[PDB]
């Protein structure tokens, strides 16, 4: 009986039950038959058990354009609310591609806005789960106004609260820009795509024939475009990566990144070397041009795992999160097995946005350095190495988080400058006995300086070493490789309490 | 400001890149990290210094040079002209020349040049026109164009309106039909952030069908790099005035100074066509040359956006100069850092 | 041809023309037949000639509820934009009672929100011209949301930019709270009303029979409710008063009130006494308790006119604007011709809000004091004199603008404290030879002090004077009445470059 208190309560229970399958129970069965989670099940999976509080569950669109009034799904195509991840509050939306293809309309947009505003207001991370076709064309330009509002909120929140975008279906059209504006883009391999304009319009306009996967899949946005930070092997893998990612980060820019329990001092660094530490002493090959795996250094410095960022992009540089002595750090490391660890356009941009992200969110930058120069090439100049390589300078000079650099081997020319040089504002500078720090390698310098294999040999035995930079104070300590972990740990402890905006090259 | 006046080789070229404006001398100056000799030995590519790092390379290919001078004196001239628009620092008003007197209603103050705007837009929505024809008629005197030989589907530069320095961001129908692409987005993004750093109002003139469709655009980073223009604009706090002269479709509408991106005053000509997408593409989803004609005559216009308040006024084109000067006076006294896409 | 540029331009001219009479030419004729101006004619009348720039002229409502979609007037019932008043920029809205009775809907509320945000962002005054029945029932709760957004913007702008409300027809329902939140309410005598609930509902609910004019006319809100600041003698007079009012005020709280040319002096104060100044020497009656009108002092201090606020309310105190030596000042003056200048609840609230407005808008406060105490009476207690009288204390103790006080005659007890005492934070304190400053009058005091006509006289003659206060430094100068103008002029020049929020009693 609708006119009684009990009847009103029972009627709410009915609307709620309907909101869980807003376009029919069969639409949910069809999602599950693909092996996929629903918009809201994605949220339950990511969030802590029983932590989700839903907002605007019973929302409905208000358009009457083109018979849209005949179908008004509860929720209007997106699920929004708040909850916890490992006990810490977050805000979240998840788009429902079963409702108008996950196309954004006005009310759907308003729901995302409320949650963006809630995250900004509370100083808490914002997780967006993206899966939708674009703007609900029937609604008209109002859809574009909500895109604008969302983009503007991503910009306002940028570097203030962590913003993570999960791409879990095809994400087409205007709103792919919101992911681009967030800090981390996590795609799911084969099951997610991101593109402005689809293959149909591309074919009609350019004659190019391309699949959605080829056009905007996880592999394309990982390896080619430099846009995806992670290409998950499945949806659960993606949620696992995001939870790991959040565990390194503070809730906002005005809060310390969370630390685990530090270890007690056991005496001098000399006397606290593990077998794994001692392995570093013999890691660098005798031959000064022989490749070695930089991850071998990384894994030996970190307490446990390395959460790598853009692992399938720009393999000449390794970037990611780990902990040293319970403290979150951002690693930036040249990889000698790719272009001999030379920098290039792509490695520069990858590393630069990473450095700025760590800086926003109070994460110390540890550089591991073995850099012969910049990758030579005509396309490098044409494609903007000067303008784009400059972004890494910019990101590093700007950073005020603790900065610690270890030169393991080469550091030559302007690349030495870029990779955590003292005079770019690095706080503590370290070098291995194998460090070679010079304007130019002996090999190319002798042609200028004595204008052959003996002059070379002279210069490199005399000047391509750690000690010239050490006597300038550009390195504060030339150290046994095994002492690296203990040094960084003491330096991180020491450093633990260190314009409208600039004009970074774009 | 960086003047490149001979061959600049090596790591110090990064200094120019970090500066706001790079002025090169054509034929007579180059910039490169690594010379042709190292390139040849490492890649086998053969290239002259001019090809590798000349003004034309850094203008047209790399998006690095803001001006390519005809000679040394021409370089100096440009740098002085550029400085005339700018304050000494971010704490100071950009300098102004005397504003004019008011002389009554807008209609009674229309010059012959103003009225020329009324007939400028072609009847065919597909026929291009040079957007410099609009810019020139809005400005007091000259236009100092920035990166004129780069990403020519967008035009960016400095002028004065009623004695006030302004930064023009305008789509160019004459190249790519005015579509945004990666290079145009980056050119205009950095320009917008430069204007905002140095207290220069941003005036957008909008005729944008969309983004340049294509495979290479996706692969080379249109989403990540196109987003820089949103970020630049959304971050700006200087006066923002946008005039849609014609097309404004889809996400490119959002990008080109949309109200909800924080534009202060939004205007449109009677030829503005503000829609999610063009009639032809829309009818396929929404519902055929009859369907299309009705969609365009019903919805592809300034008025639906006018009714949402996304445009504040649909105006005779001739009235544009007057509205802008008035809005500029109205608006004249309006984190560690963010994490723009790089 | 609507497919041509020329045809598109012609169609715009056509839409514009229709917007000037959005519900037909006949409706305009009916307005004029009453002698009233339209919404937009009120704007053209107020603003400088040819200065108006209209916004959202062609807006239409987007509601389909209850056959609403059949009537979509251009402009949605409100005229909004910006222009100038005396060459300075203002923002403005003007409600159209011919369009849905001037009732607010979503789009109408949107247009008002746009000019509020524009005023706040530009740091320019906001003028609202109010004439209408309040929320469109047909649109539903969305109209109430827009009300809320408008009220909230009024609060946000409060004390930041001058907000003036012109009430120019019958304003009924929720929205009359917006004028209340603004700084000044100007009503038109006979021809404007405001009330929350109309006479019809009041009769059905309470049985009281009342006219709209009796309920909420300009005179009612002037004399009884304390809500109207000016009761204008017609629309044009209301416009004239607002222009004058704005001439005293800066554009926002960050800007000095605008000044006219200061005079130069002809030597000392004593040597620049006009005949008008000298009249002040003989103005105070010989008989201690004989009334004199305080306007006789005010008009002789001021350069030209006195713009009086709430002239017909709480006439025991006089407040308003004038200029001294080209400088805007806010006068707060006891009126000896009403209650002998005694403070009461209504006078306290009138002066308190005026003081806080002056302080928001950088206007020096000049007090002219002749106050025997507080109006005695049981209803003064029952209706809140302790709570409401305190507000004048709060306002004054909070003020940081230049404060100058002149005691012309009486200042007794707690009312002495209230009326700009030294120890309440007054900057410069002056008194006339006729000042009587004491805990209480001689006649009440003798009862206590000597616990008889001889004792009074001894007490009066010894203690009831300017000098005991002058010796404690409570008055800085006892001065000839004629010197007052010269003294306030020098003090204003000397003083010209002089919590979340508090908890004022409400």
Swiss-Prot record, chains A, C:
Residue span, CoA carboxyltransferase N-terminal domain: 5-261
InterPro entries, A to Z: AccD/PCCB, AcCoA_carboxyl_beta, ClpP/crotonase-like_dom_sf, COA_CT_C, COA_CT_N
Pathways per UniProt: Lipid metabolism; mycolic acid biosynthesis
Activity control mechanisms: Carboxylase activity of the AccA3/AccD5 complex is stimulated by interaction with AccE5.
GO molecular function, one term: identical protein binding
Domain CoA carboxyltransferase C-terminal: 275-499
DNA damage is among the record's keywords: no
GO CC annotation, single: plasma membrane
Upregulating conditions: Expressed at higher levels during the exponential growth phase.
Catalytic function, reaction form: N(6)-carboxybiotinyl-L-lysyl-[protein] + acetyl-CoA = N(6)-biotinyl-L-lysyl-[protein] + malonyl-CoA; N(6)-carboxybiotinyl-L-lysyl-[protein] + propanoyl-CoA = methylmalonyl-CoA + N(6)-biotinyl-L-lysyl-[protein]
This enzyme's EC code(s): 2.1.3.15, 2.1.3.-
Xref: Pfam families: Carboxyl_trans
GO BP terms: carbon fixation; lipid metabolic process
Keywords: Lipid metabolism, Transferase
Role summary: Component of a biotin-dependent acyl-CoA carboxylase complex. This subunit transfers the CO2 from carboxybiotin to the CoA ester substrate. When associated with the alpha3 subunit AccA3, is involved in the carboxylation of acetyl-CoA and propionyl-CoA, with a preference for propionyl-CoA. Is also required for the activity of the long-chain acyl-CoA carboxylase (LCC) complex.
Subunit structure: Forms homohexamers. The biotin-dependent acyl-CoA carboxylase complex is composed of AccA3, which contains the biotin carboxylase (BC) and biotin carboxyl carrier protein (BCCP) domains, and AccD5, which contains the carboxyl transferase (CT) domain. The AccA3/AccD5 complex forms a dodecamer, and can associate with the epsilon subunit AccE5 (Rv3280), which stimulates carboxylation by the complex. Is also part of the long-chain acyl-CoA carboxylase (LCC) complex, which is composed of AccA3, AccD4, AccD5 and AccE5.
Family of this protein: Belongs to the AccD/PCCB family.
Protein name: Biotin-dependent acetyl-/propionyl-coenzyme A carboxylase beta5 subunit
Organism listed in the record: Mycobacterium tuberculosis (strain ATCC 25618 / H37Rv)
């Amino acid at each position: 009986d609708i006119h009684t208190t009990a009847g009103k309560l029972a009627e709410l229970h009915k609307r709620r039950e309907e909101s869980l399958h807003p376009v029919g129970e069969d639409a949910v069965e069809k999602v599950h038959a693909k092996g996929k989670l629903t918009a809201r099940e994605r949220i339950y999976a990511l969030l802590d058990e029983d932590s989700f509080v839903e907002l605007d569950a019973l929302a409905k669109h208000r358009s009457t354009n083109f018979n849209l009034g005949e179908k008004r799904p509860l929720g209007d195509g997106v699920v929004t609310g708040y909850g916890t991840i490992d006990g810490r509050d977050v805000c979240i939306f998840s788009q429902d591609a079963t409702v108008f293809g996950g196309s954004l309309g006005e009310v759907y947009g308003e729901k995302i806005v409320k949650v963006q505003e809630l995250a900004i207001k509370t100083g808490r991370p914002l997780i967006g789960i993206n899966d939708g076709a674009g703007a609900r064309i029937q609604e008209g330009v109002v859809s574009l106004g909500l895109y604008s509002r969302i983009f503007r909120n991503n910009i306002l929140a940028s570097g203030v609260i962590p913003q993570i975008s999960l791409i879990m279906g095809a994400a087409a059209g205007g709103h792919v820009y919101s992911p681009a504006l967030t800090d981390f883009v996590i795609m799911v391999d084969q099951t997610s795509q991101m593109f402005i304009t689809g293959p149909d319009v591309i074919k009609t306009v350019t004659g190019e024939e391309v699949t959605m996967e080829e056009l905007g899949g996880a592999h394309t946005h990982m390896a080619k475009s430099g846009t995806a930070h992670y290409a998950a092997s499945g949806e659960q893998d993606a949620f696992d990566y995001v939870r790991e990612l959040l565990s390194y980060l503070p809730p906002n820019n005005s809060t310390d990144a969370p630390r685990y329990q530090a270890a007690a001092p056991t005496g001098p660094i000399e006397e606290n070397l593990t077998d794994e530490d001692l392995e570093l002493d013999t890691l660098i090959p005798d031959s000064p041009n022989q490749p070695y795996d930089m991850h071998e250094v990384i894994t030996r410095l970190l307490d446990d795992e390395f959460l790598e960022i853009q692992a399938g992009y720009a393999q000449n540089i390794v970037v990611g999160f780990g902990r040293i002595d319970g403290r979150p750090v951002g690693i930036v490391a040249n990889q000698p097995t790719h272009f001999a660890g030379c920098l290039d356009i792509n490695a520069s941009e990858k590393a630069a946005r990473f450095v700025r992200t760590c800086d926003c969110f109070n994460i110390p930058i540890v550089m591991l350095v073995d850099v012969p120069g910049f990758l030579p090439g005509t396309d490098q100049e044409y494609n903007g190495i000067i303008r784009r390589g400059a972004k890494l300078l910019y990101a590093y000079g700007e950073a005020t988080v603790p900065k610690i650099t270890v030169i393991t081997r080469k550091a030559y020319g302007g690349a030495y400058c870029v990779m955590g040089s003292k005079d770019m504002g690095c706080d503590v500078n370290l070098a291995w006995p194998t460090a070679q720090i010079a304007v130019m390698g002996a090999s190319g310098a002798v042609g200028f300086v004595y204008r052959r294999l003996r002059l070379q040999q002279e210069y490199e035995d005399t000047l391509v070493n750690p000690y010239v930079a050490a006597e300038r104070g550009y390195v504060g300590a030339v150290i046994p490789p095994s002492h690296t972990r203990g040094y960084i740990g003491t330096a991180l402890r020491l450093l633990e309490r260190k314009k409208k905006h600039g004009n970074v090259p774009l």
